[PDB]
Write a protein that binds this DNA or RNA. Sequence first.
DNA 1: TCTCGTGCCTGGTGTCTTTAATCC
DNA 2: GGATTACACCCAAGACACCAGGCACGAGA
RNA 3: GCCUGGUGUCUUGGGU
Lengths: 49, 48
Amino acid sequence: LMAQVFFGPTYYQRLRHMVDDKIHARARGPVQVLTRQPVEGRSRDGGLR
Amino acid sequence: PPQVRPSIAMDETTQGQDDLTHKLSDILKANINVQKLEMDGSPQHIIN
DNA sequence: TCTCGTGCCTGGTGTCTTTAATCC
DNA sequence: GGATTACACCCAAGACACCAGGCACGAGA
RNA sequence: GCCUGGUGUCUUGGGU
């Protein structure tokens, strides 16, 4: 490489936010009894607002 | 109709009623007691 | 065998006094 | 001297009526 | 032998 590269150890920390805890998709699914609109929340197969 | 005030099941075999359902029961009970006054013991200050 | 006491279930019904800026 | 106004979306974990009266059952005399 | 329902109201802690 025409340029030299700053290189060395650094302490790195692994944070709790991982993609497979966030990814979500909904085709059809459960609805609320009251509004017959899609439910809220990843944990309930919900839809985006 | 019940679509406006659906029942929900808190822990599967136990169901509570919507706030409107409880409140309509209170209006309905209170309505019967107005009928219960005008035919007998009304000390006027009780009617109010 | 009878009576009394305690516990559980069902039904009905409340109350000692004790966060800040704007307009209309 | 009054209320109404106060970004958006999303995730997740953590909770639930009280008191009084009546009836039934069990224990003790 | 097809249909197939699992809660709410808050509060708190977080993400951009």
